[model samples]
Target: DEETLMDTKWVTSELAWTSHPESGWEEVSGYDEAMNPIRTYQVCNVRESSQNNWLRTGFIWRRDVQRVYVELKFTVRDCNSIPNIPGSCKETFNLFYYEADSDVASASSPFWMENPYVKVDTIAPDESFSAGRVNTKVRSFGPLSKAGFYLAFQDQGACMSLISVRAFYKK
Candidate 1:
């Protein structure tokens, strides 16, 4: 069987926040050095903030796929760089995933976080400004679930900017 890429629009549209009463994901836009428009979802305030937050994707349909891969593009800045934040810089963020047969309406619901999710990876970026990419597989749980998979990114005390997300599958 062949592999196929999921539409970028579909991936972006599926992004939602996991309910954390203290913080939430905020969309920000700006211009790059070359004047091209740049857009990203930031945790709390883009410049100075330390808040726990989680972002998740909607259930992806799993038909007969044997393997699924995910790619995330993001940026991180150290909280210490600004010199006024209360705590030390937290340079890492966590990635998690869940495979199931059912779908959830909103990641903002506390129930999503209550489910048993696999901690896939932890990403650490440079202290000042760093652009990073995480390419990883969404491991299958024995048989494929009809609803496919749910992926999430969590940043508890770091400043993170999510650029984009993409998914692909091999049958």
Candidate 2:
């Protein structure tokens, strides 16, 4: 098993990270360095005015990508921290697997599928979040190569951060 760190070139954000751009994603800082030592982190800042609601990560290659891992942090809001009482809310991170083959390097429109994603009950912070095993031995359809993995926040307005991502390949 070979594990590799996913750098900035592998990440894409749908919203301008700091402010404007619409199609944006950037490698910023403030990750839990203990686990994410690759360098700066990736984030999408959702300001008062923003559009789009997704982030993606992928490299230009194909392999027996067996497992996937990620670390994420979210900003929390108290039930009554402010006025108007906007009621209680929960945020979810929807994860997906966009499959690609050896031709991924040039293929414009590859296909994708939904793997089991996760939801954080609260805005807890950590760098050890895992998606379990994506390419199970008994699974059908593939040995699990890829184009990239995507995340869509349930609440588009909520700001989400990607601390670190690592992908494992079978040799």
Candidate 3:
């Protein structure tokens, strides 16, 4: 088992977003001792605009981390991958993690079915929020590898206001 803090699951810092189509993800603007934005923005070529309904899970490279678990809340109103209207309402997401294989990193996914893919999970319709976890054992098409990660999810419907989307992980 991995190390846990006081028997606590890795929790979202107060600086976390629960709403979808969020104006912006929270970050640590202020510093306690050493100045570091504990939470920084994950910039990706693919991004959701304020005018559009689609939400992009941008690219983020977690510097020195390994073996992590994550969770997010979402709804798969329609699983088209692309949004409904260009700017009407779009919602799709993928959990991508980068790997620096000390062992030869194959371009193809052999040990893993979803290697090219990080942790590929989506927001299926559900009552309470659904959660999933992936680890090294499932290392090939692994669950969560603990490195750079990507989260791509669809935006909420037009009428539906953006709620909140968040991710939590542990090393």
How much lDDT does each candidate structure score? Answer: 0.58, 0.35, 0.33
Q: Could you tell me every candidate's TM-score relative to the true structure?
A: 0.67, 0.44, 0.30
Collision pairs in model 1: none
Clashes of 3: 24
> Candidate 2 on 1-171: residue-level lDDT in tens?
445434342444422222112244444644343443333323333443343343444432443445444333333332233344333322233433344433332113322233342332223322212321112111112334464433323333433444444333434
Which residue pairs show backbone clashes in model 2? none
Off by over 4 Å in 3: 1-54, 74-119, 128-147, 155-162
lDDT per residue for candidate 3 within 53-117, as digits (tens), equals 22333334444444444443222332234444454443333344444433333323232334453
Q: What is the per-residue lDDT of model 1 for residues 1-171, given as tens digits with 9 covering 90 to 100?
A: 645444333432333444444456665563333444554566745344555676666676766766666665666775656556666457677777777777854544564545566777776553346333432224323344456777677777666666655666655
Q: Which predicted model would earn the best TM-score?
A: 1
Candidate 3's TM-score: 0.30
Q: Give per-model CA RMSD.
A: 4.8, 8.9, 11.8
Model 2: residue 61 alpha-carbon error in angstroms: 2.7
